[PDB]
């Protein structure tokens, strides 16, 4: 009915735990076996989980945590320390979040501290504990980076069990830390490039769709996990993932195009189709520049016209107003075009308010709002791309443009 | 040559001596006439070719005796401004405190001593168009201090192009009386004969010099010059613009606005720690790259 | 110690405890000034006031009116006046001053004004608006304006006054129109800028995508120099003030205002500069008050200022007349001196206010004449007259045979003129010629008419316009000192550099100078100078030094040191910069 | 209220915000021209669902503590004082305080950001922190995104979570039309207003498609229009005399108060009274400046240096405009200023006090950003019938002088 609205919502809106693996299996188990030694026995561990963006990272170790603290022993002693880079970006906000995470807001009472080795030294002491850095490259922009030192300097086995698991994107993170941290750093990582071939990804895309064993009603279950089989070996349905998939590769925008294929399954249309992926693939696929110069009156593009014709001369060297009205005059020299100076001054501001025209100069005054050198951010392909597009363009406009 | 060795070969006898003296012993008729037009709310500057230093001192030691006065050295590279105000503030209305930026110190230091006019003091700036003092904030400041009723200013310009400096606005606030007193003492005082080519310097560029502009400084501030250092070093195997540095203060946490980076990138160029080569702007360091990593330590 | 490592020190007297002693009957000299003074600023800033009345009532109307469209509708464009002040920068705040009283008697209470120099961002600006509108009647927001405007009417709109439009940031100016137009029905705000130069600042400092949410009327202020002829036709062409000034230096002041800045208070400055000039020196500038009193003062002198009265130049040609017996009465005998000052000084008196008298009809006479020839204000005529004889010249015979052809339809309102200046002053010493200016007045062959009046007031000018100069005693209330006076207002400071390199005789008179100067010239610089002339933008060290160490002898080691110091001493003066050296400012 | 010409994009919104429980986007960012109705449909699409949703101005909200108190308040008004907070670490904690409140703590709560390119010019951390909302909280909550700027300039260098961005694609003819036609005066026909309409848009659509200013232009010209219907000169039928009328006058009304040198009110009241053209000057036309002597002599050596080579200096005293003013020395200024005027000049304090005083003005604009008192460069910024006028007044011929 509508259960199948709230389940794949879930599974696609947020990130919702999914019962199955795609393709890291070798990751995870080095993983588990790093906390599942540092939970049981008295290690300390820093690993780095790099990989791109939307790849499983926070997935990961949000899975590896839950399936480890399913043990008994375990969940009674460890204690969790989330911390992000976003949110904290300063010593003092990170050691008051470190005391209100691990509930000590009552041990201390309000005694100030000579050092931040010491007070972190004195939390600690007073139980393994798992630190999670997530927004790793972050925490290097710090101006002394006493935080990763702290950390790594107390996991070089000062008899507190301490694993620190940082989560970055950044694919060159080890040459932003300096000396220090990274001489105390161990040098564990763990990749994880979203690595695997075409019929892996229709695989993940029929597998995702598909419901769960659980479900109220079964026979309606089997209907719809039937007709993703369908839909799964279908050329039209093949040839969107597969412009899909010379993109991305990643698991999120897959998310997305299946959310605007999913959204639009009514009551009166309780199936997919493939119209509806064709759709979905063309609402995410829009080019947002073209749709900018599709909004712009017929001045303005006289304008860009005037501009392109001026850097296939000077050919990118900086323009002002006067060089581009001194060539859009002599266009409508040889009537119905005909304007004074200040209606092509206002055209000219409105590209400047679109972002389609950049000032070089970042002018902390004014200067004279004409005889200012300006950039035009278009290829010549996009106002030819753009200029096709237009609804109707007149003749002699697209004349000049074309010759 | 040394500069020990020219402080300590300076045993000239000038030719004029006697006229000199008496050159010298007319403008000490006018300190009466000048304490006067003080009173009724004009300001005096002094231009000449000597070194009006030893008129003011004995200016000071002829009539300021018992008045509050302050007296302020231009010359002495470490000065700015805040160091003015901090003493008028800590020395003179004891308040001793922190004020959250300059122009608010200065909107406090005003509305004290216009609440109380029987407290009185007088300002004896030595050189006021040194490097430190130029500028329109440091004059803006200076004016906003001298237009009131009970602040009085006596002043001394060397510069040659000096009455550039301030506009319609500001000789409105400082409201001049242009006095001449050409002495002909040298400057043995003012002049430091440092960035010269003829004298060695005792060491042309030490890292001392960077690291002693570098106390005064703020932290953050510190944290905006030391990327600085870090883009540069890495460009010696053959500028960086305003627009490039302002997105890398911005993911590293320390402008909100470019106004602030604009505002402090003025104070490295006062303090010449900056030199824009202009191309489109750009941004280098003067300090060569073996001292500037030298300097990471 | 007044040099050490510290920046600045600070001198106070320890466990210690007026102005007339440095102006030393210095005494009532000094409090004569500060009456007179105090009487010319007060009647400045009365006429300050009573000058710009005109457009104030316009300001007030458009106020009134837009407030009425805000009654009307509680979308709205923010009404706005871009009044022009002139480029005289230095006069504007008085000016805001008055039209900071006129809205608060008539439009509203609430009126604040923005310095731009206060706001260098979007938080200092609205700190600073919200603490003056607290004040009359901790991170301040923009809903905090509102709250404060519903809360304290529990009507009138709020008005800002932008003081000078020229120097805000243009992000404070925009951010603070967007923010402000989408809350116009809680707050009812009116924007006033003082723009100085031209309206076209506007377009400058605002994009068409802002200034359209503005709805702006233009109004003006009354130019520079009908502000400076009304001050002039009250502060010195007139008998209530007694202090006078030579008209030289009235040349130096009027081209201190129409050359370099248009200011009136600058002209105020000059006046209270040679005021205090004349007061300072002159010791029998005691005698100058209001007439009645200078009287009473002049009884009470003593033996000193009586010889002061007979040293004066004036006073001694008017002894050189009548020789043989009232000379020696004067010279000899202290009491008839005593008197005959007394009658000398009531002559001046009536001679200035006739002569100001006959002045204003002589410029309703030239008013008439469009080609102006003596001149359009009332204060070039006084300045043209004030030191020449204006009979003797060509320019009024000139002015005379241009005057000739006019008809009696201008004249007759001429003459209504000249009767209603008569009229306006009473007690006057020219009674007859305001009963024949009656006479020829009203009258029921026209050429013969003409011709009586015209010689009428060629018998007026040459009567009563002789100059100051040819009276006794004079020099008790004018004022020359020009000189100076234009060094004190004006100084060159790099023409006073010139003049004491290339000449040192000047200051050192010791036969120093023949025209190549002398070797034992003035210590060190204008060697370093005069060899420094001659180059072409191109100096090298080495060879500059020996080019002066070439001249300076006619050890090495005390030379060449010397050489260190005067390229140091002009490096600090900023005739060299470092860069051999090869730069040459000064050419 | 009504939603005129947009039913896709109602459609898909409505769509995507799903029933009240269920969850939505994490960040959406809807982009398009200057009236496109994003912040109407948005607005009026919200209110009338019913849905709990807090709007917020980034324009009014220059700080971060600002905006995060302004979301944390309106939040709180709603859940059946005064919360502070300065850091963003703050807010996550605040708003998974104040969300579990019975109202809000099943629905799905809406917090709209107009004006969201203003964003790009506060802290680093708040634009990311705002893509990723629900995540960090975890607690059913949709940050809408309404901006004018493509997507491509708002991403950070390293990269952050996707909004799905939604086009609000502009109006043409036909929807312009339909737009300004729904509220027609009811004195007159709906088809009298609608050719009214018509007759506007033939000549104003090749210079303008913004609605807004479309629409005050149609508020301001239509007493003028329906002029000779009241005088009896021709009937609400005849369209084309009515036509005739109306165009000279809309072309005199393009070039005045389009661009708003005529103000509207002085325009309505030029317009009553059958006085509107070639009365009044404007904002432009009154370029007169009333000048000094020495400043008008100094303003023009300025301009005279600065649009002419150094090497003609010898043979006029003694690459066009197109390009611009290049800026000159103060030593270049000083010469010219002595040659260019007959009486004799000494350098007294008060012509460098007027070298720094149109500084001080939009006259001169100093772009020496080295030491400024040894040598500062100078660059005149003012047009050439400005100058002119100027030379006319003191009777100097700038034009021979001028090298092009
Ligand atoms: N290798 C994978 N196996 C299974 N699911 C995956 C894999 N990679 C991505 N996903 C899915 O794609 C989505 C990615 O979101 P996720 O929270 O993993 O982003 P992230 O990369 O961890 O975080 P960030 O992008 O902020 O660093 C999740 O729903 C996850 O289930
Ligand atoms: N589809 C529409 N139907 C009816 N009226 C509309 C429509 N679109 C816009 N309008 C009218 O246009 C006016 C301005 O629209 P709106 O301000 O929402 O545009 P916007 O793109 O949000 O502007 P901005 O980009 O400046 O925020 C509104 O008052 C509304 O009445
Ligand atoms: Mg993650
Ligand atoms: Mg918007």
Redesign the pocket.
Known sequence: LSQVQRILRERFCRQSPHSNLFGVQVQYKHLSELLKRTALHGESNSVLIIGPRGSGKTMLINHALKELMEIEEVSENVLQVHLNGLLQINDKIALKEITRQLNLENVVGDKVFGSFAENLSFLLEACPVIFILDEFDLFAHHKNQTLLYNLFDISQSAQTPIAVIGLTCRLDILELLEKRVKSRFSHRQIHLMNSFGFPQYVKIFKEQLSLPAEFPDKVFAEKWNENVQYLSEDRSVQEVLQKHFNISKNLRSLHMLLMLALNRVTASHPFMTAVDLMEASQLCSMDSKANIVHGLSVLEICLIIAMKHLNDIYEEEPFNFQMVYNEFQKFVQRSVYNFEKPVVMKAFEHLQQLELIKPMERTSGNSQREYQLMKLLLDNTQIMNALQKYPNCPTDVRQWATS | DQQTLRNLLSKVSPSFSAELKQLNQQYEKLFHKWMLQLHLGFNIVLYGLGSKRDLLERFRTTMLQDSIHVVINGFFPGISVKSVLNSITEEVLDHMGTFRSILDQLDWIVNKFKEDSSLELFLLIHNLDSQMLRGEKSQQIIGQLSSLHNIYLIASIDHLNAPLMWDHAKQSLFNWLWYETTTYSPYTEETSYENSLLVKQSGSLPLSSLTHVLRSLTPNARGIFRLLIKYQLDNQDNGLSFQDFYQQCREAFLVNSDLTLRAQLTEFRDHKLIRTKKGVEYLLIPVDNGTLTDFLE | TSSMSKGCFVFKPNSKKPIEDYFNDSKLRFETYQLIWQQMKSENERLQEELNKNLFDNLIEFLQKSHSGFQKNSLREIPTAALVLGVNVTDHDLTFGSLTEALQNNVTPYVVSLQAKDCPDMKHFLQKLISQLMDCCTHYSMDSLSSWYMTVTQSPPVVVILKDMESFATKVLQDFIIISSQHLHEFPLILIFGIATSPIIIHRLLPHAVSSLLCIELFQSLSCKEHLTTVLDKLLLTTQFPFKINEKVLQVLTNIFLYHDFSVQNFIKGLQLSLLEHFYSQPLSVLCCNLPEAKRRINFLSNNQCENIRRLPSFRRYVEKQASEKQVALLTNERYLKEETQLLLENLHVYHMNYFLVLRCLHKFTSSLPKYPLGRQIRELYCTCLEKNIWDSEEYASVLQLLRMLAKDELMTILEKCFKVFKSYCENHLGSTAKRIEEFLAQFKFEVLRENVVNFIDCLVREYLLPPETQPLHEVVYFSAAHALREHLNAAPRIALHTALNNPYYYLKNEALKSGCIPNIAPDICIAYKLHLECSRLINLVDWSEAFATVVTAMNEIIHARFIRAVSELELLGFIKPTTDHVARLT | ??????ESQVSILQSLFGERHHFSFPSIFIY????????????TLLKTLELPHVFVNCVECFTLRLLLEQILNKLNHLSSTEITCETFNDFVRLFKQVTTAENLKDQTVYIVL??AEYLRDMEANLLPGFLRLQELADRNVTVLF?S?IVWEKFRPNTGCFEPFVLY?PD?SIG?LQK?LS?DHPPEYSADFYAAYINILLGVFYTVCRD??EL?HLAVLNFPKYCEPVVKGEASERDTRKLWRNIEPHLKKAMQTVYLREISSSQWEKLQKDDTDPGQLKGLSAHTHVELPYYSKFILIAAYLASYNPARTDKRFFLSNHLLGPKPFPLDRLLAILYSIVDSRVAPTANIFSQITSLVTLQLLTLVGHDDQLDGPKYKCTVSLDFIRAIARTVNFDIIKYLYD
Do not use: M, W
């Open positions: 209220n009504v939603v005129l010409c947009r398009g021209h200057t009236a496109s109705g994003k912040t109407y449909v948005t607005q107009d004006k309404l004018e609000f109006y929807n737009i729904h609605l807004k629409r």
